[PDB]
Amino acid sequence: QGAEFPELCSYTWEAVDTKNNMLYKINICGNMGVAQCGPSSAVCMHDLKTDSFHSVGDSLLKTASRSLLEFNTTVNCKQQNHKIQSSITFLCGKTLGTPEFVTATDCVHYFEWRTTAACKKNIFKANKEVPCYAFDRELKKHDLNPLIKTSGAYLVDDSDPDTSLFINVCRDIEVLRASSPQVRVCPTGAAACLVRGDRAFDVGRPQEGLKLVSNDRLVLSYVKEGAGQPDFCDGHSPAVTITFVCPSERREGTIPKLTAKSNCRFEIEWVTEYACHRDYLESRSCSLSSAQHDVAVDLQPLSRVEASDSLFYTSEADEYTYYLSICGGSQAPICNKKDAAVCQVKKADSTQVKVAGRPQNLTLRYSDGDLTLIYFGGEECSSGFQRMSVINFECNQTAGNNGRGAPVFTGEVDCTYFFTWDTKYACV
Numbered sequence: 403q404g405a406e407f408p409e410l411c412s413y414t415w416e417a418v419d420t421k422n423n424m425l426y427k428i429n430i431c432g433n434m435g436v437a438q439c440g441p442s443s444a445v446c447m448h449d450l451k452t453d454s455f456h457s458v459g460d461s462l463l464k465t466a467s468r469s470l471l472e473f474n475t476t477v478n479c480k481q482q483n484h485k486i487q488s489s490i491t492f493l494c495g496k497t498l499g500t501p502e503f504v505t506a507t508d509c510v511h512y513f514e515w516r517t518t519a520a521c522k523k524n525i526f527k528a529n530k531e532v533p534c535y536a537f538d539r540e541l542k543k544h545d546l547n548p549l550i551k552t553s554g555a556y557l558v559d560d561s562d563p564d565t566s567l568f569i570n571v572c573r574d575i576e577v578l579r580a581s582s583p584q585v586r587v588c589p590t591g592a593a594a595c596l597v598r599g600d601r602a603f604d605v606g607r608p609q610e611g612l613k614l615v616s617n618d619r620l621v622l623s624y625v626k627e628g629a630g631q632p633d634f635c636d637g638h639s640p641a642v643t644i645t646f647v648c649p650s651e652r653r654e655g656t657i658p659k660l661t662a663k664s665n666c667r668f669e670i671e672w673v674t675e676y677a678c679h680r681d682y683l684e685s686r687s688c689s690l691s692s693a694q695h696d697v698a699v700d701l702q703p704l705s706r707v708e709a710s711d712s713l714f715y716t717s718e719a720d721e722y723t724y725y726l727s728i729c730g731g732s733q734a735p736i737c738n739k740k741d742a743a744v745c746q747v748k749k750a751d752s753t754q755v756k757v758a759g760r761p762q763n764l765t766l767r768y769s770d771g772d773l774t775l776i777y778f779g780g781e782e783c784s785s786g787f788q789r790m791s792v793i794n795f796e797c798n799q800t801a802g803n804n805g806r807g808a809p810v811f812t813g814e815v816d817c818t819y820f821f822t823w824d825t826k827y828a829c830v
């Protein structure tokens with residue numbers, strides 16, 4: 403078909419309101435198969451407190467807009483004259499993403515979904531992508547979206563100097579836009595590719611979404627149906643199973659590893675903190691705590707400087723100049739009212755300024771030994787993607803500027819601007 407976010411109708415998506423112990427099941431097409439919800443429920447709410455189900459949005463009472471889906475119901479609200487409703491705002495994203503619970507009134511349940519399905523150009527869409535997250539019994543989110551590559555793949559660790567095993571997470575490997583002459587040899591649509599020198603073989607494609615087996619173990623399975631197999635396996639249909647493991651203790655990142663290769667039925671283990679609860683990895687402020695993240699970080703001191711130099715940071719590039727105002731700091735004059743944490747100014751014409759990240763939209767993340775600060779919600783690019791900036795922090799106890807260091811623009815990839823920043827404040 404292709405009507406109203408097609409690639410999303412293939413699955414039933416969950417979302418949660420942790421403050422109220424509510425687990426939501428979302429099926430934009432209205433067919434999650436939950437007897438307690440009703441056959442046409444589009445948004446079903448599982449009240450875990452009373453263990454009961456209530457549809458809060460019906461697929462047959464849908465109103466669609468460019469980036470908005472509203473589902474009404476015939477259920478009267480606690481507030482007289484109002485019916486229960488559910489509303490999902492869509493924004494362009496680079497991965498399939500997840501429907502994030504935003505808030506709920508007594509009558510309306512609001513969600514926000516940043517997904518490749520809501521972009522203006524099918525350009526960001528993967529050939530095939532599946533849900534890449536799962537909630538545990540405590541309603542904590544285990545999200546692998548950050549590991550999904552929109553270009554290239556991951557070289558898996560094994561012991562075959564004739565085989566090079568490449569995989570992507572929750573989707574096919576983009577072989578067209580690949581810089582590796584090796585990956586550029588893989589078949590399109592493949593999520594797992596075996597390169598036996600001057601030859602590549604699709605040994606797995608995405609089908610089902612990520613699954614949680616234990617509070618610290620996530621499993622993803624790629625398969626292949628029908629004949630036409632490589633046959634080096636002797637009639638065995640290729641299959642790949644990846645087990646993502648959340649380490650009990652923080653540690654440096656490790657590469658996924660091949661633990662089995664029983665003839666076209668590869669098994670990989672990947673120990674990564676991305677498999678842990680998301681709230682253990684992220685903060686919506688410039689600090690991480692030992693209590694919540696097992697790491698103590700505070701970037702607030704980077705927004706302050708001696709009464710001698712600029713109140714903001716300047717990161718020059720070939721055709722643009724970037725001004726960064728971090729952790730509530732002050733912005734450069736040129737980026738006046740704009741309210742941007744990161745602002746891009748065209749060198750050739752300084753009247754062209756684009757917000758590349760807003761202060762109210764920040765995520766400080768620490769996972770697998772890397773500290774990242776992300777500012778999002780910037781002005782939309784032609785693709786519909788709101789500009790965003792990612793600052794890859796690096797520990798350096800003797801970093802210049804008395805430890806504060808300074809941001810260095812390292813490049814742009816489709817409206818996501820990257821910077822590297824060595825600072826003593828990134829030392830864990």
Ligand SMILES: *[C@@H]1O[C@H](CO)[C@@H](O[C@@H]2O[C@H](CO)[C@@H](O[C@@H]3O[C@H](CO[C@H]4O[C@H](CO)[C@@H](O)[C@H](O)[C@@H]4O)[C@@H](O)[C@H](O[C@H]4O[C@H](CO)[C@@H](O)[C@H](O)[C@@H]4O)[C@@H]3O)[C@H](O)[C@H]2NC(C)=O)[C@H](O)[C@H]1NC(C)=O
Nearest residue numbers: 461462463464465466472473474475483484485486487488
């Ligand atoms: C889910 O439950 C809700 C809550 O009751 C219902 O929501 C109402 O839905 C109607 C549409 O059926 C809404 O009315 C429509 O609003 C559109 C937007 O209005 C704003 O923006 C325009 C910009 O052009 C302004 O002109 C306008 O003043 C507002 O600022 C309008 O564009 C629509 O206009 C079209 O229809 C009307 C007649 O309905 C024509 O006169 C016009 O020429 C034009 O063709 C329309 O007015 C209404 O606002 C919603 N109420 C809310 C949100 O509280 C849903 O209908 C229900 N779902 C289902 C399936 O029934």
Ligand SMILES: *[C@@H]1O[C@H](CO)[C@@H](O[C@@H]2O[C@H](CO)[C@@H](O)[C@H](O)[C@H]2NC(C)=O)[C@H](O)[C@H]1NC(C)=O
Nearest residue numbers: 502504514686741760761762763764778779780
């Ligand atoms: C992105 O930042 C904006 C503000 O900079 C947040 O959006 C605001 O949300 C409130 C309600 O919470 C609205 O009243 C405002 O109108 C919104 N601002 C505008 C003009 O868009 C948004 O919530 C931030 N994203 C997240 C998830 O933190």
